[PDB]
Design a protein around this ligand. Sequence first.
Ligand SMILES: Nc1nc2c(ncn2[C@@H]2O[C@H](COP(=O)(O)O)[C@@H](O)[C@H]2O)c(=O)[nH]1
Ligand SMILES: Nc1nc2c(ncn2[C@@H]2O[C@H](COP(=O)(O)O)[C@@H](O)[C@H]2O)c(=O)[nH]1
Ligand SMILES: Nc1nc2c(ncn2[C@@H]2O[C@H](COP(=O)(O)O)[C@@H](O)[C@H]2O)c(=O)[nH]1
Ligand SMILES: Nc1nc2c(ncn2[C@@H]2O[C@H](COP(=O)(O)O)[C@@H](O)[C@H]2O)c(=O)[nH]1
Ligand SMILES: Nc1nc2c(ncn2[C@@H]2O[C@H](COP(=O)(O)O)[C@@H](O)[C@H]2O)c(=O)[nH]1
Ligand SMILES: Nc1nc2c(ncn2[C@@H]2O[C@H](COP(=O)(O)O)[C@@H](O)[C@H]2O)c(=O)[nH]1
Ligand SMILES: Nc1nc2c(ncn2[C@@H]2O[C@H](COP(=O)(O)O)[C@@H](O)[C@H]2O)c(=O)[nH]1
Ligand SMILES: Nc1nc2c(ncn2[C@@H]2O[C@H](COP(=O)(O)O)[C@@H](O)[C@H]2O)c(=O)[nH]1
Ligand SMILES: [K+]
Ligand SMILES: [K+]
Ligand SMILES: [K+]
Ligand SMILES: [K+]
Lengths: 384, 384, 384, 384
Amino acid sequence: TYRDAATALEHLATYAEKDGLSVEQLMDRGGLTYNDFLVLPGKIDFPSSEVVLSSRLTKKITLNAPFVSSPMDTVTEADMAIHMALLGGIGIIHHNCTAEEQAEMVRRVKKYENDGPLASKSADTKQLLCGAAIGTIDADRQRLAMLVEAGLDVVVLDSSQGNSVFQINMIKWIKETFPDLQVIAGNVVTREQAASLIHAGADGLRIGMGSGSICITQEVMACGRPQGTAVYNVTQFANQFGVPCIADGGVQNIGHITKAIALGASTVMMGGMLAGTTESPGEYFFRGKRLKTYRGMGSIDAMQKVLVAQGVTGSVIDKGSIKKYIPYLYNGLQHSCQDIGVRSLVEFREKVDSGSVRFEFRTPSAQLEGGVHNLHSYEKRLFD
Amino acid sequence: TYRDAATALEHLATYAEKDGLSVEQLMDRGGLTYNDFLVLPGKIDFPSSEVVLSSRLTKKITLNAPFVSSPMDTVTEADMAIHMALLGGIGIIHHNCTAEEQAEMVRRVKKYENDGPLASKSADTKQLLCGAAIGTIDADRQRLAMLVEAGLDVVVLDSSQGNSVFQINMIKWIKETFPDLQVIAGNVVTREQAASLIHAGADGLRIGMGSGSICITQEVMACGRPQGTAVYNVTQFANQFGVPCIADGGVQNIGHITKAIALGASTVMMGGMLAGTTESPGEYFFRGKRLKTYRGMGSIDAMQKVLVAQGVTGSVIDKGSIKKYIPYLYNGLQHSCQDIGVRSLVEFREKVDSGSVRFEFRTPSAQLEGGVHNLHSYEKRLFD
Amino acid sequence: TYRDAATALEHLATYAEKDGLSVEQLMDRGGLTYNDFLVLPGKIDFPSSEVVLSSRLTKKITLNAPFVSSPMDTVTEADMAIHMALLGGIGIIHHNCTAEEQAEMVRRVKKYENDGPLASKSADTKQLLCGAAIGTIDADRQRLAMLVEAGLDVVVLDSSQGNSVFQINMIKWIKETFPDLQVIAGNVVTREQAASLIHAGADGLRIGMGSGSICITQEVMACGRPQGTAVYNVTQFANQFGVPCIADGGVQNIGHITKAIALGASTVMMGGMLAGTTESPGEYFFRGKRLKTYRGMGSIDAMQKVLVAQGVTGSVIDKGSIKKYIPYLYNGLQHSCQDIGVRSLVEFREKVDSGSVRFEFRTPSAQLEGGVHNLHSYEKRLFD
Amino acid sequence: TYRDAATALEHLATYAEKDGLSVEQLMDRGGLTYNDFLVLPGKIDFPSSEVVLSSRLTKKITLNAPFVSSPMDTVTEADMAIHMALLGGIGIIHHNCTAEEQAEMVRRVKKYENDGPLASKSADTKQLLCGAAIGTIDADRQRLAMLVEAGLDVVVLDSSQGNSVFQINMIKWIKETFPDLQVIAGNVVTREQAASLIHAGADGLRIGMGSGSICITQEVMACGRPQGTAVYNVTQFANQFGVPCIADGGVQNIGHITKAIALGASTVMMGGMLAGTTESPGEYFFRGKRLKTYRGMGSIDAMQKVLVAQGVTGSVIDKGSIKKYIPYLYNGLQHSCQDIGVRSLVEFREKVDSGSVRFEFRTPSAQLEGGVHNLHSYEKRLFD
Ligand SMILES: Nc1nc2c(ncn2[C@@H]2O[C@H](COP(=O)(O)O)[C@@H](O)[C@H]2O)c(=O)[nH]1
Ligand SMILES: Nc1nc2c(ncn2[C@@H]2O[C@H](COP(=O)(O)O)[C@@H](O)[C@H]2O)c(=O)[nH]1
Ligand SMILES: Nc1nc2c(ncn2[C@@H]2O[C@H](COP(=O)(O)O)[C@@H](O)[C@H]2O)c(=O)[nH]1
Ligand SMILES: Nc1nc2c(ncn2[C@@H]2O[C@H](COP(=O)(O)O)[C@@H](O)[C@H]2O)c(=O)[nH]1
Ligand SMILES: Nc1nc2c(ncn2[C@@H]2O[C@H](COP(=O)(O)O)[C@@H](O)[C@H]2O)c(=O)[nH]1
Ligand SMILES: Nc1nc2c(ncn2[C@@H]2O[C@H](COP(=O)(O)O)[C@@H](O)[C@H]2O)c(=O)[nH]1
Ligand SMILES: Nc1nc2c(ncn2[C@@H]2O[C@H](COP(=O)(O)O)[C@@H](O)[C@H]2O)c(=O)[nH]1
Ligand SMILES: Nc1nc2c(ncn2[C@@H]2O[C@H](COP(=O)(O)O)[C@@H](O)[C@H]2O)c(=O)[nH]1
Ligand SMILES: [K+]
Ligand SMILES: [K+]
Ligand SMILES: [K+]
Ligand SMILES: [K+]
């Protein structure tokens, strides 16, 4: 005999747990990253337009969208930072330039006037928010003072391995000298690295080592971590201290953004996805495709603007303007949250942590099935 | 000393279990799909022509073959639906057209006269059975009323994520308003989604999220499930309620059909396998191959007949007529059942559930060995 | 302080077990085949020329080399069977021909005169040994009687799924009617299939389903087994009855032969490795490579000499004469045994079963490392 | 409420263990090699220039860098050995030449005069250190006597499978006859092989079987081991006897060197990485790339300077001079140690063994993320 349909919801209670895995079950198949798993769908009872994407950048800075442009010389100068802020995220201006040049870029962002209600602006002056990267040697103290004079809102201490005495000393010096400046420390991939930087006074952490599209650190240094695993393990610790984390590297699509946030990230940082856009630095050139250069900051070319390279110089295809691309990401992330059944990124965090949001692993065959497969040809047009 | 051959069958009883895995052992290596495993052969004591492929589409509709054509605008209009029904399966007419156009397609199927004893026909009028897809917004109520007037037998509520209040409300409205119309709800991939739709009144479920050959939902939404795992987990629940399930997406060959049914599906739905056949919509074009367009219903092109695409536009090679292709699938499935040792799909279900039918995982090397390998060249001619 | 070198052998006794895995530990990572593991080296205290490769084909037939040519119409006619026997193995003549044609091929082998001390010959007449394949329908009774009149030594009952009532009845009929004829039954991949055929009276078993280079049975039927796993599980049972097994399909190189024997096979059968040799049937043709056709017996082309194909038609490159190729395999297998530390295939079996021979799994990265890697170009010249 | 940042280091003590895996947890996912895992970063509190790379070659020979050039006829003759020693490593001169020719090569190294403070030199004469390979048959006794007369410092007994009575007898004869000559035995991949050679009197071991870029031993012999697993398991035993081990084969980049040492190796041997350099034997030729031949010593070509090949002949691209390449490796390894948080290779060993250094597995997706990914094109320029 068959069960009565009227009892179907009640019958769920006979199972020991919800279908799929909790995030803890998932992350206990070690060394995973984003492509190794999926989020299972939930219950839809609201429109995607309802989904709020407010996200913490640092202890005191919140954005309307979890999107941060990388401090790379082929990704973020003033044009990128202005437009990222207008669209609800933020740009981190690179430091492969003189201190005077970098301060001028920050000034250009801070003085911009020409906006939507989601724009990233200071609460007092209503100027666009601006970030910038620096190193952690003594000369960077004067560089930072110039950036602060230019109106900097947040500084990123830029390193492939941020758990160093130099970086710790720089965090302490900044918190003493410029107490109102928010500091993002990193990069980190372990709980121990995170503890060290948090203890030094970081207002946020940048997570990732070797995941970048242009990065060869794992090959040449043998050192790094799979990105999803790094995000989970760092944020499981950092989130207890109210220290928001940026998932930096290895993001190529909306689903990576969703997954990074599911695993504990507060924001996501993009280099390659934003390289090749109109607002990135560098000129377009042709090959019969329209291209831009995109290069690691540890590439020989970037370092020269024996040397051991930790990144490569390459090219990416023209992506058009971020005035279309960022709204695509935003709308896509709203739709992703809707499918999962959550109405905000705050709720997404809460429901992952409670075990309400469920996950599944993907075997290599499942990854192939999940991608485009068994066509003679196709065009992958992502948005209109 | 060696054992006496006369004792060989008796000696089987000394083992703790049958060789290979039960379906429960298999599905406990998480995130698997069809290519990750095989069914082990059994005992042959009947001809393949003996195998019966009768399959439940919905609570009240049974087909002579477990084959359902997808409601896509490059797969199923009236020609496809007519021929699928003549061959013992069914077509689901797409809704990327006006309600009047869709009702005319249904009418054409219902009025067709020109048949084999396996044809899918109504028990009272002996008209070919016809299905059709609709959405779940308010305008779809009037669309459905027009399709019902045209003689529709089964409606498919068409969504990538069917566990929504809109779809639940539509199921309830249909069951009240058109009590004799069978309703297939979905798409679903979890037990909880299935419970929700069954409780609302669904007569069948459509299983799958992201497995389609033209689908990029997993990449862009981070949300979906490996198809084999979805089929198993949904049907383990749904089958208890006597709610038949369609395994939709990711089917490319006869073995996927066998595996879908082994894992609990009652029928299988095909888009890509049927695209490029004579009876599909759209014209052939050349490139030096003869091709047809095959596109996701969430492709920019289909949606336009910012937008976030969940499918792509592509092409597939000419497959010839389903008048040859469906008999190939049918005969092939008979042979597959024969190898496994089962005389009907009902028996296949029973013997999987009892642990008589056994399975084995396949490592990536085993998958390569199982495919064509180590030839200079080959032609893959599937049937004569 | 460091340990004294004089104690190093004694120190081995402090470990719980030998380094690496026993075959039981290996085969408990389910669904493996040959490329998934390696045999660990042992102690060399003899020359490779000492290694004896005597192998049981059936209960009453032993060969000097474990090499059997497949009964395929692009692999074994009389020329192949003659030369295989002269070199210490055997050929199985195909049956895609009339009974009169097949009997003439057998007669040609049995009447050949023109030899090395390892040649496969009958003990009474000193004629070359010959095998032949038949089907298991009623017409095959008269075919077999003609082959027996021609001097056949061993018959192979040819099927992709040999556990059938037709094959069981044929085994029983042969054992009654031609009691001195050795019968190899199959193909099988499970313990239960093996028990059924052994109980019927088989003198040997042919193991494999879907592993053949030209075979698509796993794709189209969903039914088969990874070859290494099939060999282990069938032979673990069959060897208890003194029923030798042929590991048939998926062999491409000497290491596959070693691994097949390690896992319990008594002999190995080759199609693709022997196709394209001078002694195989069919003419060479050019494309700018010299090629031969190699095709599955379930290909449309072979069957035609709706139809559901279970194999493909392809091509392989010219391999030269088996007068060089078989001695390469023989010498290579001697060297492989030497590396492992065993002086005969009998000893190899004994030392695997006792846990003296050890194994290791290979991750995909380990397989890539084990192959040729990181060269601009290379030539893979296997022998001089 | 959030935890106080001041407590972050203290909070680490609430976890059961450090983040990531100990080497024992890692090596318990069997059959792994270098690309399957990463080393997690530590704490940086020193400059990379502080890192010392002193490494034990044998019981009595220590080098300033862990780099050994392979005894192959396309890698190491006198030019390579001279320059390797000048740069702090050592060369092993090949023996595919007459004894007189080989002795002349050794003499050329020992008589060289033209140096940095890291040069590998004898403590008494201050001559460059030189190694050489020999076989283990009787004729090699006279060959070795000639090499000793020429001033040889270390002999490598050259075999793909060194656990043989011939090699054991050769070790014993050398230790008796030339007691001041250091002997490296091998190749080995198991604990049992290592015990046998250590007991015979080896001063060092050469680890690896089948991992070489030009090697096909695993394919043809079915015998070998994944390199990382071999290094771990051999050295776990050998290091207890104070017998240093060379990780030979499968090294392509700095990270493989780091990983080999992490797993217990004392030095690393390179063939392919050093082939194609100015100092390797053989002339450059063009194809529109500048190339050199690089070939296995078990290739038909090398053996001919039936035969069963265990290696291939190929080509590699011009790498320039080792006067730049070795300093790249040295500086890179210093940077790798810095990221991990260790100031010497001795410290690296100690901190791996204590569980302070942590590791992580990498799924195939994590390996793809760790490599260069999702670029239109790129150039992989490793150093300036
Ligand atoms: N159940 C439910 N579905 C909705 C709601 N709003 C939109 N949808 C559905 O979700 C899909 C995405 O629509 P969007 O949310 O982009 O407007 C559409 O098929 C739409 O009908 C809602 O409030 N409840
Ligand atoms: N190790 C390393 N990381 C880099 C380099 N250049 C950029 N990065 C990292 O790569 C990230 C961008 O990754 P993507 O978004 O392209 O995957 C940056 O935000 C930064 O973390 C480089 O040369 N080496
Ligand atoms: N044991 C057995 N084998 C059969 C039977 N019917 C067909 N076969 C065998 O199964 C294979 C497929 O034949 P088909 O079933 O397509 O006619 C053929 O080799 C055929 O001889 C049967 O009733 N019993
Ligand atoms: N998510 C998604 N699913 C699609 C889209 N178009 C078709 N589908 C699904 O893909 C199935 C066809 O998959 P196929 O048989 O080609 O593998 C359809 O029946 C439907 O479930 C699309 O654009 N997006
Ligand atoms: N220990 C040992 N090594 C041998 C013996 N015979 C041959 N070898 C070695 O094994 C390798 C293969 O030689 P083959 O066995 O092909 O003559 C050669 O390097 C050879 O020196 C033996 O009896 N004992
Ligand atoms: N299922 C199937 N097996 C085949 C077919 N033709 C040959 N075989 C199998 O493939 C084996 C040869 O495999 P190979 O040595 O080329 O890997 C044969 O001995 C036989 O077992 C075919 O069309 N279908
Ligand atoms: N914390 C710390 N960082 C250092 C030290 N020495 C160099 N670094 C940093 O490590 C990176 C590599 O520099 P190098 O060690 O090659 O000079 C640089 O960014 C440098 O600033 C040190 O003693 N302590
Ligand atoms: N089995 C085998 N090993 C080889 C052969 N030639 C070189 N080798 C090994 O390959 C190593 C070089 O590996 P590579 O650095 O190119 O990966 C050598 O040091 C040696 O151990 C060969 O023909 N066969
Ligand atoms: K897909
Ligand atoms: K195959
Ligand atoms: K190799
Ligand atoms: K990378």
